[PDB]
Amino acid sequence: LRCHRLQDSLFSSDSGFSNYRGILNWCVVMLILSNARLFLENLIKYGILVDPIQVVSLFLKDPYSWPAPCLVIAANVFAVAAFQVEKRLAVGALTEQAGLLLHVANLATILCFPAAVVLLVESITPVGSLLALMAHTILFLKLFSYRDVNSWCRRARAKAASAHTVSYPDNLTYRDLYYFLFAPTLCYELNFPRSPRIRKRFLLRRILEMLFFTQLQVGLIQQWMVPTIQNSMKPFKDMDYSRIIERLLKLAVPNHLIWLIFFYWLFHSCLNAVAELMQFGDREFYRDWWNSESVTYFWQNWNIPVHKWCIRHFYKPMLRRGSSKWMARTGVFLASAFFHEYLVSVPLRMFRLWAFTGMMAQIPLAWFVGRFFQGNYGNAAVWLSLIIGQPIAVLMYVHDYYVLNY
Amino acid sequence: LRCHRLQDSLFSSDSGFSNYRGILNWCVVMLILSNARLFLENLIKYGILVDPIQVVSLFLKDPYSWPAPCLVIAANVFAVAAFQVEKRLAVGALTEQAGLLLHVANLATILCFPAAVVLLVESITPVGSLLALMAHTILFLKLFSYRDVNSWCRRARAKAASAHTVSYPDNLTYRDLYYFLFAPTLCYELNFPRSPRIRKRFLLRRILEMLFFTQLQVGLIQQWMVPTIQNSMKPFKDMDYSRIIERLLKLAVPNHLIWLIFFYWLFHSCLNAVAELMQFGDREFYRDWWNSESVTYFWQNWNIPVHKWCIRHFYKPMLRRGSSKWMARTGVFLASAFFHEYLVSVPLRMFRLWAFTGMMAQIPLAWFVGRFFQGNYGNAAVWLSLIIGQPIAVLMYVHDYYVLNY
Numbered sequence: 001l002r003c004h005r006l007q008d009s010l011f012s013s014d015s016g017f018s019n020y021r022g023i024l025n026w027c028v029v030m031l032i033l034s035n036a037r038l039f040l041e042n043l044i045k046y047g048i049l050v051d052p053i054q055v056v057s058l059f060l061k062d063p064y065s066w067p068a069p070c071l072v073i074a075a076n077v078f079a080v081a082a083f084q085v086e087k088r089l090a091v092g093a094l095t096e097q098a099g100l101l102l103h104v105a106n107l108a109t110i111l112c113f114p115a116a117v118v119l120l121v122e123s124i125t126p127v128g129s130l131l132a133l134m135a136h137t138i139l140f141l142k143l144f145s146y147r148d149v150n151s152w153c154r155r156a157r158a159k160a161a162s163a164h165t166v167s168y169p170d171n172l173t174y175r176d177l178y179y180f181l182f183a184p185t186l187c188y189e190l191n192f193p194r195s196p197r198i199r200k201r202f203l204l205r206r207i208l209e210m211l212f213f214t215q216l217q218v219g220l221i222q223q224w225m226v227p228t229i230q231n232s233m234k235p236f237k238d239m240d241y242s243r244i245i246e247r248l249l250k251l252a253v254p255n256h257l258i259w260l261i262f263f264y265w266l267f268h269s270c271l272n273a274v275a276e277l278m279q280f281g282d283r284e285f286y287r288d289w290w291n292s293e294s295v296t297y298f299w300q301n302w303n304i305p306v307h308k309w310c311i312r313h314f315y316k317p318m319l320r321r322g323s324s325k326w327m328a329r330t331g332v333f334l335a336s337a338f339f340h341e342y343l344v345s346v347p348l349r350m351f352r353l354w355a356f357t358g359m360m361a362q363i364p365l366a367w368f369v370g371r372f373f374q375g376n377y378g379n380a381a382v383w384l385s386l387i388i389g390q391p392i393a394v395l396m397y398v399h400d401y402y403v404l405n406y
Numbered sequence: 407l408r409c410h411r412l413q414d415s416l417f418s419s420d421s422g423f424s425n426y427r428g429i430l431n432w433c434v435v436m437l438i439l440s441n442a443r444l445f446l447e448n449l450i451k452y453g454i455l456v457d458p459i460q461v462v463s464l465f466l467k468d469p470y471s472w473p474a475p476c477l478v479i480a481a482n483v484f485a486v487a488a489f490q491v492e493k494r495l496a497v498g499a500l501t502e503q504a505g506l507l508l509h510v511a512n513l514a515t516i517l518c519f520p521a522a523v524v525l526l527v528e529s530i531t532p533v534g535s536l537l538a539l540m541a542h543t544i545l546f547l548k549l550f551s552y553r554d555v556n557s558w559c560r561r562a563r564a565k566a567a568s569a570h571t572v573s574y575p576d577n578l579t580y581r582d583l584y585y586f587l588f589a590p591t592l593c594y595e596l597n598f599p600r601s602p603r604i605r606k607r608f609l610l611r612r613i614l615e616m617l618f619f620t621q622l623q624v625g626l627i628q629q630w631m632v633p634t635i636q637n638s639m640k641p642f643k644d645m646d647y648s649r650i651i652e653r654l655l656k657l658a659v660p661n662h663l664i665w666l667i668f669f670y671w672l673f674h675s676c677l678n679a680v681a682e683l684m685q686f687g688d689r690e691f692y693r694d695w696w697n698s699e700s701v702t703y704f705w706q707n708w709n710i711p712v713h714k715w716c717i718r719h720f721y722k723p724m725l726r727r728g729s730s731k732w733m734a735r736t737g738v739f740l741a742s743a744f745f746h747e748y749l750v751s752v753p754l755r756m757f758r759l760w761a762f763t764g765m766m767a768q769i770p771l772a773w774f775v776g777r778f779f780q781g782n783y784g785n786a787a788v789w790l791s792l793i794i795g796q797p798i799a800v801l802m803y804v805h806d807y808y809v810l811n812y
């Protein structure tokens with residue numbers, strides 16, 4: 001009979017096959033084959049140490065010598081302040097405007113305090129400073145959501161006053177609040193879907209992933225990105241467009257690989273290990289941002305938590321409390337650009353305003369890729385927009401900081 | 407409301423997402439970025455020549471100086487002989503056993519003749535010899551199917567004698583036969599599903615793919631695989647197991663990449679370009695052989711044409727004309743191993759019997775991977791079975807030929 005149907009080839013541009021889970025297994029197996037010996041050497045070297053005990057002892061025996069963990073611990077006072085304000089206005093005190101302005105004061109403090117500290121203290125490491133600011137902005141967003149959720153459910157109980165799952169007031173416990181603090185998400189919500197058990201094997205796999213990709217990224221930086229700069233240690237702040245782009249074209253690809261490894265090490269390994277140590281269940285940290293035939297589809301699927309935050313605490317409100325979805329989304333990108341700048345500049349005491357420029361230029365870039373390319377061609381366009389794109393801004397900052405110091 | 411469903415992460419081992427078409431676009435864009443300048447230089451150098459005209463002139467002005475195209479042209483006599491036998495026994499001459507033994511003689515000739523020529527003529531290049539043998543084995547399989555299909559439809563017309571689409575006898579035309587000869591498939595069938603038009607853009611894309619990957623593979627060989635041998639030019643025929651494996655571990659990865667590029671350049675670019683020059687429509691040359699959580703699933707999806715051939719001319723018959731599916735599939739692997747050996751050894755006048763050994767050891771390897779691993783773990787096991795696996799046999803042969811001559 002007819003043993004020749006009229007069809008089209010899999011890889012072909014328009015078959016619509018899309019079942020390539022097994023290309024990634026190839027990437028995994030090649031990475032293992034190509035770095036396994038080195039990783040085993042580095043593990044049998046470093047991992048035999050007593051890292052947790054020695055670090056906690058060396059810290060506790062003399063604090064104030066690392067102001068970054070000092071600051072990370074100091075964030076607890078803002079956490080507790082927000083908890084206390086909520087619990088006070090839970091019974092009826094602090095008429096709603098009072099609680100609102102107390103929350104606003106607390107949040108503005110959470111922002112302006114660690115920045116002021118890292119700016120007016122020289123004995124702090126830029127990596128520790130970045131981690132401190134990261135913790136503080138995560139706390140800012142988490143507490144913003146805490147306030148909004150508690151306000152919503154309180155006004156719901158108020159309207160009901162005109163007449164297993166946890167109800168409104170009985171949730172305000174220290175354990176609940178801290179659990180929300182350390183949970184891999186930015187959207188507060190009672191009754192977080194817990195996971196049944198711990199799955200020690202899964203946990204171990206994720207820790208191994210973290211260690212592996214950490215060592216691999218150290219290797220990438222040391223052996224591919226640093227020498228390319230050491231060959232000409234001259235900052236960008238003084239170069240001209242020609243030399244800037246001539247250097248960036250040589251720096252791009254390794255930067256992009258480092259960025260991909262940041263993603264996989266943080267958004268899938270770290271967060272999963274955390275959510276496993278403390279059964280959290282949800283674990284939708286990212287959608288298929290890769291096969292994204294647009295930019296507005298890339299942002300809606302890279303870093304899910306931040307997306308659903310910007311949506312249900314910053315986009316939907318400014319639509320119900322306003323109009324002009326264009327204005328709203330531009331506000332989203334504006335706030336995110338400010339946050340990027342606050343995140344990268346302040347730890348390095350630079351203000352070149354570059355990351356802001358990149359996040360903002362995303363908008364014309366988005367319209368460009370939307371008007372011109374389509375399909376897999378559009379996906380390639382987005383990949384280009386990622387290789388040179390945004391993650392080159394952080395690279396420019398780190399470049400002009402490294403050449404100026406080493 | 408509930409904005410936290412209980413789900414699992416995409417990359418995670420058991421979500422079952424599998425929509426990674428866009429990882430491959432990343433591979434494409436990275437390859438372009440990393441080889442585009444070099445490819446444009448090599449194109450602006452070589453492609454300006456007059457390759458077709460000059461080659462046809464230099465051949466036609468003095469034949470017998472390249473016996474490989476001589477032999478490729480000589481295959482036409484076997485093609486015409488099979489055509490003639492079919493047309494004669496179409497009217498009634500050559501009682502079925504006569505036609506059968508004439509076909510058997512013709513096929514045995516198609517096999518034993520080019521081998522004898524390339525074995526008893528020293529002025530032939532090993533690459534040209536390989537191409538000649540490839541053409542002859544393709545012709546062998548195509549004519550085997552031609553015979554079987556014509557026999558089936560003839561006996562169908564015979565049973566009907568006891569009482570738009572093309573019927574049985576009106577197909578035996580030179581144009582039809584030659585069209586089947588040059589069509590990217592091994593299963594003869596009247597009324598091949600034609601494609602509407604030519605799609606010049608598609609054609610150009612495929613030719614560019616061929617040229618690109620050709621230059622890229624030349625680069626791979628010259629700059630990664632050759633020097634690794636030139637550092638120690640000693641044949642395997644004399645080494646010991648230790649040194650053999652010590653060299654193979656260093657040769658494996660580049661070999662595997664060369665093999666992948668063979669696949670993509672031949673099974674998707676070359677065949678598609680051909681089937682486009684001559685609207686053929688079908689274009690199912692391969693199924694998803696990568697994400698293949700087994701070996702028996704890898705073979706059933708790598709090189710579709712050969713699979714459906716072995717099935718509906720060599721497996722199904724030996725099941726209806728026999729039993730013991732185990733015996734049948736072992737016969738399939740035995741014949742394929744003989745064909746591999748005939749294909750690689752004879753052009754190099756070696757007989758180390760290695761490729762046969764690899765194709766045969768696939769069987770215990772298949773049972774191994776089937777019993778032990780599962781899921782993505784099984785897929786990784788198969789990838790390993792491909793990296794060291796079978797495509798190392800051809801590498802051993804080419805190694806022991808190259809060290810002995812250069």
Ligand SMILES: O=C(O)C[C@H]1CC[C@@H](c2ccc(-c3ccc4nc(C(=O)NCc5ccc(OC(F)(F)F)cc5)cn4c3)cc2)CC1
Pocket residue numbers: 540702705706708709712713716721735738739742743
């Ligand atoms: O039904 C059930 O459930 C059972 C099922 C069981 C198993 C199944 C079965 C088993 C084996 C094979 C089979 C074996 C060997 C083999 N080799 C090729 C091949 O790709 N050749 C390499 C090559 C290299 C170079 C080249 O180009 C150039 F020019 F370089 F030479 C062209 C090709 C394709 N094969 C297919 C098929 C099917 C039967 C039924």
Ligand SMILES: O=C(O)C[C@H]1CC[C@H](c2ccc(-c3ccc4nc(C(=O)NCc5ccc(OC(F)(F)F)cc5)cn4c3)cc2)CC1
Pocket residue numbers: 134266296299300302303306307310311315329332333336337
């Ligand atoms: O779809 C409609 O309905 C229309 C409309 C709706 C709204 C939508 C939208 C949503 C979100 C964003 C947006 C913006 C910025 C942003 N940045 C992050 C991010 O993850 N990258 C920074 C980073 C994080 C961690 C990190 O780790 C460490 F530790 F190194 F710091 C390093 C860097 C996530 N973002 C998300 C923008 C727009 C647009 C469409």
